[PDB]
Design a binder for these strands. Sequence first.
RNA 1: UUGUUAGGACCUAAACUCAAUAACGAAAGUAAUUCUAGUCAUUUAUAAUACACGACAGCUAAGACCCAAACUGGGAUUAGAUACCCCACUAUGCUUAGCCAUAAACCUAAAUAAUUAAAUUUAACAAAACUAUUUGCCAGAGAACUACUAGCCAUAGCUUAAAACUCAAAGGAC
Lengths: 97, 100, 137, 86, 50, 20, 39, 78, 122, 111, 97
Amino acid sequence: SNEDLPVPMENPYKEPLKKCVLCEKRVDYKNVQLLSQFISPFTGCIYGRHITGLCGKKQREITKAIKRAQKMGFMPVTYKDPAYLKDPRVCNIRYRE
Amino acid sequence: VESFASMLRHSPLTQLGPAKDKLVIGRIFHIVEDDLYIDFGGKFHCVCKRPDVDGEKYQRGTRVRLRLLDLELTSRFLGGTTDTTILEADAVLLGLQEIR
Amino acid sequence: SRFSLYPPVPGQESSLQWAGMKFEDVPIAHIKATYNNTQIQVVSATNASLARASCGTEGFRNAKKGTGIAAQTAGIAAAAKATGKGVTHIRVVVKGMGPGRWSAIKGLTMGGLEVISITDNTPVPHXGCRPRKARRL
Amino acid sequence: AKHLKFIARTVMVQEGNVEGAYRTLNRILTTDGLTEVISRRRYYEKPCRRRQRESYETCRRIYNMEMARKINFLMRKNRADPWLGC
Amino acid sequence: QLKEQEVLKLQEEAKNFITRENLEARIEEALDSPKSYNWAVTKEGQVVRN
Amino acid sequence: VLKIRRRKMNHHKYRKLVKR
Amino acid sequence: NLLKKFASKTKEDSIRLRVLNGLLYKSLTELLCTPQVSQ
Amino acid sequence: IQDIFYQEDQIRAKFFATYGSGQKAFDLFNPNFKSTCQRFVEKYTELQNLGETDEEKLFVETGKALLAEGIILRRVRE
Amino acid sequence: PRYELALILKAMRRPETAAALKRTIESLMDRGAIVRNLESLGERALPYRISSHSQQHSRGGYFLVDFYAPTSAVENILEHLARDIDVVRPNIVKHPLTQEVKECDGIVPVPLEEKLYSTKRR
Amino acid sequence: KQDDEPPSSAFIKEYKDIIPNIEKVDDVVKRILSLEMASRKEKLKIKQEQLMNKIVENPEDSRTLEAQIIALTVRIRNYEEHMQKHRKDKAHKRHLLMSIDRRKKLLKILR
Amino acid sequence: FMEPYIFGNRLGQDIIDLDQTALNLQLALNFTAHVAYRKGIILFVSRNRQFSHLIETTAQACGEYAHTRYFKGGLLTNAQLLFGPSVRLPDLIIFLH
RNA sequence: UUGUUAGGACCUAAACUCAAUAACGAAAGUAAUUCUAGUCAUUUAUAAUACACGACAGCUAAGACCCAAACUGGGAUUAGAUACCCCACUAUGCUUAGCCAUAAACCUAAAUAAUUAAAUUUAACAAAACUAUUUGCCAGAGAACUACUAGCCAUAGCUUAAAACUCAAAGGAC
Ligand code: FES
Ligand SMILES: [Mg+2]
Ligand SMILES: [Mg+2]
Ligand SMILES: [Mg+2]
Ligand SMILES: [Mg+2]
Ligand SMILES: [Mg+2]
Ligand SMILES: [Mg+2]
Ligand SMILES: [Mg+2]
Ligand SMILES: [Mg+2]
């Protein structure tokens, strides 16, 4: 009929979905340096997923690892260890104005 | 006579592929204060702001360079059964095209 | 080469000294700011009491005992007692969230003491004791 | 009670600006939600009321974000009239 | 094939398991070499071991 | 509206009567 | 139903009003001494 | 509604992922405009008519042919 | 199954620390275990002050012991280690390596409309 | 009790037919892959397989009514052992009574 | 009700079959000619303000009428009150928009 | 008594942030940590006179007891306070064994498989509509979550559930 008619196919130009910072990375309770990047420096409170930027799965993984680390004598509870204050910033939170 | 299906396949707009982060040439057809209305060959025009450098050069008929983002700005909002369109395109004016 | 809001880390070497004292040595001003009375106690870094004051001891009574100006007087009174004992720099640990929480710290400054840091120790239970029932008014 | 004292919830005064230190400590304790927690924990909120309150906040936050999105989506179309006289 | 390989891998790994004979020697090797599980990520998702 | 109030008021008068 | 819900287009008094006035003042003063309401 | 996808789009998608959009700007007012990407697809087709069956072979050979033509193709991973 | 022990030990000199790790690992073997690896993480300051056996501790030596044991031995091991006077805090968990990092494509956009079907009902 | 209980030296169902082929395997490796270092769930997969061989004509098929009945007898006897220790577990007491009733329904269709 | 006329969706932008457009446009132009031939009144109607002056200039060139402004309620259903007792309504309305 | 304690003891009770999450369970219900046990295939719908469960409050017995708190006492308030507010304190909330079987036990939606067009706002409002299958249930309101009856560890209890008589309405959504 017509050679120029469009051909059914999956979108070639499809854009890959957006991954979180921890996508496909092991989250362990002993890696307190990674865990400390998602708590508050002053209170030690876990940040929500609107701050950490994580997905549901990794948000739950970090939460379960911080609590296990805190309960097994690896991580503090009421603050962030001063030795990890220098690590990079991944969380969308600015205490200073 | 060429068929419509052939025309669409070989059309410059069909060749562009996705219009995000593409480079295109536009023409200024309407100016309102420091807002330039630029036709880049699509359905909807874009509207950019006159650059501080060489502001006087951007007059009507002047061909410029653009970085497309969307061909039409549209978005569905809560409680809407159809998309809300502002009947405008999104592009970033980069500067005048060298006549050469 | 910038100021750090975070306090010095205990057990490390720092260049920050106040009146030839390290951070761990600077005396502590314990402010208990409740909704009725604001108490203040100043202690040395070895936990020895030096000054004490409160809105009640100043002479305020009942609802006046729980105002901002009442706590300010208590801080100025605690400062004067502390200044006599030989205290120039204090670490302010403010427990409680009452009306004279800030005013007590402002009185201490007016009394001639130099605050170098402000800590908060308001009790926050992690799940704890059932609070009293809501008031119906 | 078992942790180290003066690391948690401690700000440092810069150049004797004792008020600025306190005002920053307040912004910290509020951003972290400790302020609301201490206020609400004065009296007992019953489990049924806590769930009603949290469901309302979530729906309130969703509606305030979408309405802001609609206003910000049409922020650019608010410009000088190009077709004045028509 | 997969299960045969998995069994063989465990057999090779079992060479270096601890036993009563090599307990004290393996204890001293562990004390000599500390290990670290700490690492951090950037906003780009890149590990940053120190 | 008045139907639960009436069940309540009717139920209230039965519990009082049972007590007497 | 969110849009429907949140559009929302459609001597006793003397002693009671001496307690609400005092308490509301006590409470609103505390609200404004923190960033809780707003910065 | 049929999604309009021609067979050239498979080639065009690879070109945009490997080299991005040609540094020359698209002119959508010229009805017969030939972009750098459309020339890549015209040469890629010619080689495929000869009978090359490997997509990798057709992608690197077309790049060499355009390099001889003088077109500046930058393999921008960024 | 495969379990990872997390053994915080009292801060001691190497002679006594080595004796503590020999006595400990021997107990695992006596309970029918197959010890696979021993790792040290170093002496450090505890995140908080842990009180064990009528002594307050601020520093301890962190160690990991990878091993296999029946499901019935896990409880007996923890009971024995809790009675040891050189053990600040023993914690047995299922070995992390037995758990495999899942494969994720990405975050698919969720329409808020299908979140007000979720949240309005809640 | 029942006539057959899997020995502790038996290999798990994944490696039941793989280790015999391997020429030589260490005692430790056999012990890691035995039923001593496995969960109770693994020991139940061996009990079921033993019964399927001894009863079903074609043990390869597990969708037959006779095979489904065998699957529920292992679960039923498992829930009973659970309930002998957890006397006040009401979720598992329900699981036991619902499987018993399920087995009766399947035995009725088979008959 | 427009899906019959849409050739397809080119990466989010619906494309309009120009073969149906030619057939429909032929009928519409033929009908517009017979109406104009018989001396009927033709009213061009649009509310797009970019093309308000162009459409008013076109109507004047043709010899017909244009209404590109705010449309009063009742203009056609209550025309006698608005325009007069014997006002003749349009015989054809061309909606550019 | 108070404040401080980087002093000691206790291991009672409850589980911040995470949670802007929407998972698990038949429902009730369930989110401190770890480990053990553990949810799984009947084609699908359809069950009581049987079996097993069932928030909170309450009963029985032995314990626990930080805090909260019916009742009770004290203080104030008011023409009166038998309440609201303040202080003290008990049953009770907890554990171990039973019992009781009640909720606006509500998503005020029986389950299951369809379809989205039948020119279906087929009242309105909720939650778009609608077909088929099977069971349960309903037939004006009040009298009546009542009387009597039978069953039940329930004894001021629960489930089951009328009539006389009265009215011309009751009721629902806007
Ligand atoms: S987006 Fe892949 S794990 Fe978070
Ligand atoms: Mg307890
Ligand atoms: Mg298990
Ligand atoms: Mg009591
Ligand atoms: Mg409900
Ligand atoms: Mg009842
Ligand atoms: Mg009755
Ligand atoms: Mg009866
Ligand atoms: Mg009747």
